[PDB]
């Protein structure tokens, strides 16, 4: 550990933007659409769409862990604490060569294969007061989730029920104990944000996460169900996360696509409610892959040599 006190701000961390831009370029030479459409305006309202048609090679895009080592004239500083807001003065900081192996998983609503919370479930937010700022949840115990191009994902109803609890409890432990915690599905928006979207085998899965976010701080949902089955769908025409615009990928082909990932975290986003009675409603969120990266770099910060 480094014997000094420094400031950290994962919400304004620059490595996030440095990885994000990398992960995008890690996408332009691995997953290339058959056609990519992107807004093109002079400002005069009228906006032509810039079209691009390239080969559409079916590649089973399988993410490789990524390290981030400071070159020279630069040093990475890691924060150490069982519960770090990731936005303030860190006491147990410590210089490191490369950040832990991170598997740049691009997804929405659920953070897959990320890094678990050592102690307990932690939830960071650039401002919990602002019903506009994504709440990044960090699970201390991942929940396996298996998706298949066959059309769905299975999740443990047990583990997910617990998780919502040990999350619902960490929420009120920030918005007011004497406050009811509820979970509802997406409010609306793009398919990629409304469902738990992500990529598996180069196939863009779109799983309906209603059964994962319709939890009332009162009842249950395990009648005749051992596992939660999200009705997933693979799309060819998708909205790009790298930049405003659609993109069409070629249909599936491999006799079988399969994924078994660790739900290591979520991206929630409680609704304003305009100071109404203690009844905070949290819904799935994300779509801004940087929050993802953040959830992984929340305790890092590269700095110039002295």
């Amino acid at each position, epitope marked *: 550990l480094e014997n000094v006190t420094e400031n950290f701000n994962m919400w304004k961390n620059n490595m996030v933007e440095q990885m994000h831009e990398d992960i995008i370029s890690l996408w332009d030479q691995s997953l290339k659409p058959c*056609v990519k459409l992107t807004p093109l305006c002079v400002g005069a309202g009228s906006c032509n769409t810039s079209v691009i048609t390239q080969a559409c090679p079916k590649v089973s895009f399988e993410p490789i862990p990524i390290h981030y080592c400071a070159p020279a004239g630069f040093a990475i500083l890691k924060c150490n604490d069982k519960k770090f807001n990731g936005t303030g003065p860190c006491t147990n900081v410590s210089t490191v060569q490369c950040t832990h192996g991170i598997r740049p998983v691009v997804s929405t609503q659920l953070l897959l294969n990320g890094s678990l919370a050592e102690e307990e479930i932690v939830i960071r937010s650039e401002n919990f007061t602002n019903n506009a700022k994504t709440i990044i949840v960090q699970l201390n115990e991942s929940v396996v989730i298996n998706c298949t191009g066959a059309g769905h994902c299975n999740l443990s109803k047990t583990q997910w029920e617990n998780t919502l609890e040990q999350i619902a409890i960490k929420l009120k432990e920030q918005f007011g104990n004497n406050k009811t915690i509820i979970f509802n599905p997406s409010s609306g928006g793009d*398919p990629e944000i409304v469902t738990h979207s992500f990529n598996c085998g180069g196939e863009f899965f779109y799983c309906n996460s209603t059964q994962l976010f319709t939890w009332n701080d009162t009842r249950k949902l395990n009648n005749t169900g051992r596992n939660i089955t999200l009705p997933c769908r693979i*799309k*060819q*025409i998708i909205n790009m996360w790298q930049e405003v615009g659609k993109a069409m990928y070629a*249909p599936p082909i491999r006799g079988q696509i399969r994924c078994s990932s660790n739900i290591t975290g979520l991206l929630l986003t409680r609704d304003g409610g305009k100071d109404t009675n203690g009844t905070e409603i949290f819904r799935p969120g994300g779509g801004d892959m940087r929050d993802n990266w953040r959830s992984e770099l929340y305790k890092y910060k590269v700095v110039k040599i002295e």
Partner: antibody
Amino acid sequence: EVQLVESGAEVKKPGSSVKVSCKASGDTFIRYSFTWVRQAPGQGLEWMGRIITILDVAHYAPHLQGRVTITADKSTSTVYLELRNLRSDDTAVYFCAGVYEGEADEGEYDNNGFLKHWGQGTLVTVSS
Amino acid sequence: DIVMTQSPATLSVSPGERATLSCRASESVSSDLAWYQQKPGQAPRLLIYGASTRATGVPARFSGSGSGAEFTLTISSLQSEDFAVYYCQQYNNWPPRYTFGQGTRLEIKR
């Protein structure tokens, strides 16, 4: 199960431009990708291009790039094929052809090259 | 740039008999190959697609065979109505640059 209807046969003169219509009915328009296939008398099919309707993108035949365009009016449910700078050889029966693509209005898209549904065909005579 | 050549420019055969057509392709077109049938003065007719799969509502006598650059639309007991020119369509490259065969007339030999 769609039924494609085309505009009337037109007699255009050299160096001009012609626009053939193609009414698509009987199913979900945006779920189809339409292709124009021309055929000169005595000659055989020649791929003119295809419009991935829903996306409003269309790719064309090498020997036509520049002088041809394919557009679709989702409102009226029509597809159009425009050839400009008409030559005599362009004289042919221009066919309108389409294929189902899948729940394209839902992100699903097979992007099929073959053509399951064909038009009645529109003849265009480009001569002086 | 793909050339699709239908070797049998013309095939004279009699009803009930078995007629065979062969479409030759430049480079490999995998299985993105369809077959069409055209009666004089009619829009083509999608017979086979994906090389070996008949289009909805088509006589089982039409056999779609092949893969790569060698396809074959073989027909068992040819029928009176089976007289027409046959066309193979290549639609495997992308960007889209589909090409048609030059044809084959399935004329009745008498």
